[PDB]
Symmetry: D2
Subunit: 489 residues, 4 copies
Amino acid sequence: IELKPKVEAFLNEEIKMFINGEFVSAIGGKTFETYNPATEDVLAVVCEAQEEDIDAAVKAARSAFESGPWAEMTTAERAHLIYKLADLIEEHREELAQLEALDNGKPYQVALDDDISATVENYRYYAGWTTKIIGQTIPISKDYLNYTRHEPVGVVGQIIPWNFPLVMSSWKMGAALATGCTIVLKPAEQTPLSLLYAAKLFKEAGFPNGVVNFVPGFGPEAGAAIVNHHDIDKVAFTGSTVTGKYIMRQSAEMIKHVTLELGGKSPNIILEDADLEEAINGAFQGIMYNHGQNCSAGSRVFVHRKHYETVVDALVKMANNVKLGAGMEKETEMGPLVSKKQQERVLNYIEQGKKEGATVAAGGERALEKGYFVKPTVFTDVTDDMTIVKEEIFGPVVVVLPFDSTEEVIERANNSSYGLAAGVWTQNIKTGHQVANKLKAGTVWINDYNLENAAAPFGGYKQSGIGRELGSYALDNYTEVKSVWVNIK
Amino acid sequence: LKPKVEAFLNEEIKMFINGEFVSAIGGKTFETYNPATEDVLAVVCEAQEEDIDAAVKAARSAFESGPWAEMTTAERAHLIYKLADLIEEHREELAQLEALDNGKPYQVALDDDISATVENYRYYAGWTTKIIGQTIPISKDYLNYTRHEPVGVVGQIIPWNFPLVMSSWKMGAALATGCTIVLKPAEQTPLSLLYAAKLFKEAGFPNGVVNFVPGFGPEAGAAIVNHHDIDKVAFTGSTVTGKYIMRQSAEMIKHVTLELGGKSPNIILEDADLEEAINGAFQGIMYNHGQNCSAGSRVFVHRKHYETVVDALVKMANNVKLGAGMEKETEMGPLVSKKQQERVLNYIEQGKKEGATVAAGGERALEKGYFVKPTVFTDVTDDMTIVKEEIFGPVVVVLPFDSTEEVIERANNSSYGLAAGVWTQNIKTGHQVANKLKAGTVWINDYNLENAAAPFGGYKQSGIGRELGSYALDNYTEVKSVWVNIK
Amino acid sequence: TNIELKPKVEAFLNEEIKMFINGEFVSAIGGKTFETYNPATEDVLAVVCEAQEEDIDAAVKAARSAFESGPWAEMTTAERAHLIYKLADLIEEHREELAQLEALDNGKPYQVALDDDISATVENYRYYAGWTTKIIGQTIPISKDYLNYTRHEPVGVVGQIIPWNFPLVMSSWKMGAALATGCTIVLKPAEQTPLSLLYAAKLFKEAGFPNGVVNFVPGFGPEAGAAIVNHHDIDKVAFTGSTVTGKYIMRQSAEMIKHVTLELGGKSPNIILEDADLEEAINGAFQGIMYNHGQNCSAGSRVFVHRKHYETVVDALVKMANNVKLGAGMEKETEMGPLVSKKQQERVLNYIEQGKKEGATVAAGGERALEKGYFVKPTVFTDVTDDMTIVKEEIFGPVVVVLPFDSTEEVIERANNSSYGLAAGVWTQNIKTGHQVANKLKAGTVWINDYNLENAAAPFGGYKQSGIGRELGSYALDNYTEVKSVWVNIK
Amino acid sequence: TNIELKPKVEAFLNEEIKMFINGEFVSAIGGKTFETYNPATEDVLAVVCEAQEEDIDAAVKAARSAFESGPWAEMTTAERAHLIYKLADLIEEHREELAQLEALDNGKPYQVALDDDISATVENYRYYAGWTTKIIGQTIPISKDYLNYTRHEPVGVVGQIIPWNFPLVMSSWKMGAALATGCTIVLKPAEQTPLSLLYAAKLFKEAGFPNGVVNFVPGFGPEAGAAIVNHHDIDKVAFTGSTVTGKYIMRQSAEMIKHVTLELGGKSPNIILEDADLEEAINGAFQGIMYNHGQNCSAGSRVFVHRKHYETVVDALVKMANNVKLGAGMEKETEMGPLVSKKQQERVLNYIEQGKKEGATVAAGGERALEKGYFVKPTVFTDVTDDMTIVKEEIFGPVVVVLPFDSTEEVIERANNSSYGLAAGVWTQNIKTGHQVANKLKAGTVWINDYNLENAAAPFGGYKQSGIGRELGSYALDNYTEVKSVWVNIK
Ligand code: NA
Ligand code: NA
Ligand code: NA
Ligand code: NA
């Protein structure tokens, strides 16, 4: 796949930040590098945000929230800006998908069809909410008029990760912008290009200066400055369960609202009456989609004993057949992990699996000459206390376990600190709904897997998070409820 | 003294766990006082870490299986409504308990606290059958719906200023969602909650649905917040403890809803009805002896009327009749504890020494009891301690201003934003100001109003989330999105 | 073995039965009375004061006045809720009295009136008492120059007419939702069954309802019903009854541009696909039609059976039909009572004849039962086609029609070809086929692997000619509200 | 000073104007035509194809077909949303063309058609496009044994009829909400003004609306309008127009138990209390009636003034009436156009004569204006009383009645003493009295210190004989919906 003229032009220069409407370098001129994970080459050199640039972005956001066009503008006008942004993202679909395949590592075609169209659709959907963020009129007594106002919190601080970079930026900004908030967003050090290219689309659509501010860099500096900034009203984060604790601890000094989307160890359960063909594909896609770098991956495939052998065999074959290559290569089905660090983490989870007694039915090592690749892996002969079955691996690594009863599979699926999503496969109308009701997960797919949509909320139970993104529900994280009483005698 | 409260005070006060009245496993007890007399009112079983582990087991169990978990929403509603009736039937008993244990006048405990508690459980009983999720039209290939499921076991800690009512703010919404509870009342006021336990058993709550565990903050309180099986935590009290509660909740990605301190403004604009505004400004701070998170402790008054309102507030400050809550003539009681009286008396000294002048009060009252005279500070600056910090006593600070843009900025220049009041006869100016103030609830030409139906909570460091109204149900809910492939 | 008359019902039945206007128990201004019967024995059960137009007029005046001013206009939402809740406690307390009056006046079995009817009505009032404090409007963010908000105001005086089949629960369907909004009421029960309601009047009084909030005016359709439909001062109207009278109401209401809510009949289909848990569907098919002697608007009067199962289902429906114990609602052994009236008995017997004349075979039942009383035998019709009078028209008796089908697309099309569409039942164990079929059926309520379920929190009503609007749930409240949009210039 | 005709509107008028059925532009099957005029000049503006009853069957078949299968039935909600949004972009692209048609065909000033009408129609479609993805039903927790959910199903083929006063925006009020639900439409524009909507039809083709989702049928009320109202296959009817035709529609709709929506006339009151900002209120009172030449259902045709200010506002309204610049809508100087037709001019001139016959005084206007065209002078009536025809009936021209009043309780009695209740205006600087008076007024929209504000997000509709239901806001969606309650037994 050849590089688009516009990405070629964008990559031929240092990548600048976006603060108060202008593209800029860091105040002290620091820069960092982002890699193409298929080759290990440098892809771009990016301006690095420091504590001081984060202060400059927060000021810009604060000033755009209080005075200015963003603050005076009608709800209909604001909706139009957000919808114009989506048209532009759609105009630039090929450019964004190329950037995403190159910087993050996923196959071009799926970044075009899944990521880019999902981010488009999410802004279209949230553009419609600006005019519909309603409060209440509460009849209490004829002596008062009681109403509530859902006022945007103000300046929000957002940090997203590297696995679905552009789409993850829309999960945080669609809802936030629709309430009328102002943003200071930090992309992952591994994948800042998509959003920095998107920056020019926020300007072209007509976003007023400072409404949106993009700051690439590192957690120890740019991330920390976001979470600790005194003039940031609310914070939102997606990433590892470990950092969400830190962010929630640091947010306690200001009593700041928090939204957290974290890891999982989600189950995909195949009961006796499942349509096995559809469920084997679901289990396989469930873990292998996006190389398993998906918090909601169906990393624990539970299979009723009657079908266990059949699905272990089918999933091994599928695993051995996946096609590894660079994301810009047209016949690639799975790319590599995003970084040397990640490859080393997941490979180590594999060793850990091995030496704790489990077996490698497929994969279980690196792949190819260069790049951060890992062969799709299938672990068999597994136990519930094993590290590979309790902990999020973040790679194309599945663990398959047999069970004998429905009561049993429900108890084992729930026996986790995580609770993000789950899958249940059965043709029965009663057991599909019964099983989904008892599972302690934020999303449940009956006879399918890995589905998201701007309109249906997403988030975890337990240590998989606090709050929800997508749908009407995400609006509430960016709002502050005011209850007005008007005495009328 | 009512016979049922006499019988209740005649024995050590037991905790309520898994449907039963029990003593602490380790046998410890603590004393609760009567703040008018300084005497011990009762000895109470003291909950240790291991009593909290027993309450949580009982809670966990009642939620996972059994009647509470199997009950229709109409059946749950009936139980909650029946509790409301029982609290109403025992209104005089609970009112006396509140007055004796907290300190507040009997009649206000009866007319406000008990009726508000009853109203709250009737309101929330009404929501059990009405907590709906959505059906989302997305695609003909799927059926998309959300369930609003209860979180599970909740940990609740409440303060001493409005002991019974706050047990309802917390429990009514949680119980309506089908949650199970572990609640610790304040050590200064454990009595009314523990007497109300009787009424949960008599209404028919199955065992373990509710568990009352009194004790101290660094033992029972920390046991709740650090407990591995508590699914969600809610707290009302100081902003300094709230930080601790959120820090510790972080270890387990536990949801938190917090109601905390304030330093709310009560603004008298030039076109206000001055007679109504003076009374509102005075009730605003002096209600419940200023032991109220939402108290209007900063009275801003347009320069044109500053001196008029100071005279009136001084007059009214000295007219307040101080005495024990159990005496009929009493308008204001004492402060809850010795520690509190020292605290507010020490805030008064800090104000004199910073250069403010005490136009009324500013010292203790009477021979015994933790009483402080209603106090009015003048010649104050925004810079002073007495004007930034929550005093939590019957102390008001009166501040002249010259313009509407100035007052808005000075009101908002705070770390707090729980509540605010604005007094103005003008339609436009009333809503413009209301919109502009960074505060959870704004009252236009009124002050201190609460209702089960209207959300309450703070912006900034006054809190996270809201209690009361429909809004409160969300804190006790875990949202599940279900996708059913029908293609 | 007769169920013994309750002392308070004998006291009640001993006097002439009065109307309830402006808080007082009154006779008709003209002094006219009519008779109500016991459809099991045909005796006169009670003498009831009969409302004329003049009486309806005084009901409206009392209603108007309780709405515009006084305690009910001034009460807080909590106070109103408490009233509604107290009313439900009192209905629960008089449960036996009320269930006997239902058994006695309507004819249905006492135990089912107790367990179902009465407790549904208690529970419907408790549900709605809970809405009172929660009927919320919107705050709409349009622009920084205005404060935009809505008010969901009560319409005012509401004219309500209910039928005879579920007398007390049908009273609660109408009044719970309307009273919750803060509306005022003029209610008319069916000439066949006025007693459940006029007894319940004691309890509205004992609960502390202010005068004129609630007004019960029994009588006949051509006088009292029409006076309500036509009153210049009635703000909104709600009706349940024949699809023929629904039209008259909706036609008259045109003159005053009055909002109308209608609940009317059906020919609801009960579909048993191949993958049904058959034992269950057979019990649902039988109860779907036989419950309440088929005097149910949502009766699954058309039982569609996939061909594999048709013979099995017919055999079972026949045997069950023939085993039903017919008797008086007040006898303990009774499983099914009589039809409400002589007129109704003549209507269904006649529909049965039309059935035989058109070619269908009567597999069970098909005639009157017992020596006296308005009884009809549970009836099963086979050898039926979609064009027959009996499969198209509502019979309103314990009469079922059983039809084989050979594919799902076929049964959906045949189920849907009706001017009715009140309810539907589908029996299948498949997760996809269940919801697919439920989505394709044109009905207001679809039950999947069940039938005849109602609950206060779940809307009910028809598509096509089975009605307009919905009752129960949050949805019912909108019928009694007038949305007001207020704009406040804030410069 | 003439506004130059846009070349695309010149091309469009150069030809016979076709109707729009099943995505194609067609003539009437019978070949009939009628003429629409320019009310400023009285010449024929265009010849338009006249839809007969046969043409309404064709429109309905195509709508029916587009609702049951094909892309419109298959489409995801994000896809339907995207069609509605693309439409809004195209209307905005053609803003000048559409505003000129409005000005030429209806009579109103170009600049106001542009700024108000066109911009509001674009914004209404944008708002409703946002609703397609967010139209949700409920999941109701009743018991562990069932899963209870509801679906908001589109009703199906909807018949729509709109008037001539705000032609395009009224087309969007009706279609935005109906399309958002997933309905299929058959829409009759008024005989006096079909141009706007038949031109916009080009933009529905170009946005990619599937064949038959939208069908535009122009003609006369007694042929095409009647054919829509009486068509057996239309599932729902919506109408904006005269109180009299609203009665006819409801009466006819009874026959099929078809839901109705009615946006009818008014006689709205505009109240200036003793404490109003008199500057702003005089302008409000004036704009309140004269906007769109008084051809507005919600016009403040009754301006009530506290006695203290009566003379000051009479004097100001008279000075402002005598100053309105009457002229063609396509001339730049123009502040007020002509009435829409000969017939409408006679009707308002007649009401003015009825006013003088009953004893009222003309303080300004009261007669025709200019050489040709259908103009009437802005008119101000005084010395008027409540029982007069002019203060009671909707005139529908630039004719106001000013009434003094002495107390607040008094003016609320007199404003509410009307069969109308569409809107109302209240001017007072006091926070308390502002809401108190808004609370007590029986009108669907109350503007506190403003008048004539409509937004896509705020509901609009009348109380009493001013209508049934609401349009705009979330509330309009329910008129195009059918509620289905699904119960899934889960043991
Ligand atoms: Na990279
Ligand atoms: Na105490
Ligand atoms: Na009878
Ligand atoms: Na014309």
